[PDB]
Amino acid sequence: MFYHISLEHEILLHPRYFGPNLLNTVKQKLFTEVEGTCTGKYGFVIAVTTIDNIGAGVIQPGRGFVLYPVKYKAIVFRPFKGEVVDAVVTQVNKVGLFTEIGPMSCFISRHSIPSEMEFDPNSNPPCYKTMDEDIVIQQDDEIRLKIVGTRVDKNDIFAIGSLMDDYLGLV
Amino acid sequence: QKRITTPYMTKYERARVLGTRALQIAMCAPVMVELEGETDPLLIAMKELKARKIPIIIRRYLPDGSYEDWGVDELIISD
């Protein structure tokens, strides 16, 4: 889910950047450190809107690197547990549907999929289709799923979804 | 403003300011004053203090928790 937040990040600036308008260097540096990363607590930081203010630069003793506490406004993608949200299918395998909820990728297990659905390996491209064939889930298909749980791995958030709940599927 | 600390710069502050600046100069930091062939980084920072150009701002923490931002240029150094 997308939110508007005000976060704090301590920016480490090398003394080489102590030239004219170093705040510009600090400002531009913040567009690389917290931009494009994925903090495990607040989720993916997809973009930064503006900068609130830049705090006083404290020189760390011994290290010689000035620390700049800067406040900025950014939008994060934090998948809350037990939240239903639309997803896009990227691939389908016997294990289960592989979905894509925006920046992150959510995996759907075969057990979580309704028993009526049955994987068809030949059908080009593969797509979980039930015997009645009223509903089929192909690749790049907009489907709604509920995230039972989320786990943080290697500075990234991995989500597990399910479709057992009512009104989850193509609709 | 409303600063109650002594206008003069203490010896400890002078030593740390020059040392930190000298370390910065050795790290490809820019020099405000003109360079006349002074290779040793300490000399570069020493004349910077004389000309009152060091960007470092001294934040003196009072024992009560308050802090005063005293600039190196503002402080009266002894030469």
């Binding site: 102590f18 030239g19 004219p20 630069g57 404290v58 | 820019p30 020099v31 960007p55 470092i56 934040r59």
Partner: peptide, 21 residues
């Protein structure tokens, strides 16, 4: 041990300066 004061970098004063190289 010399910790009653901390040195803080100021950008307004750094607005002037040329790199040695």
């Amino acid at each position: 041990g010399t910790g009653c004061f901390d040195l803080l970098l100021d950008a307004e004063k750094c607005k002037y300066g040329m790199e040695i190289p």
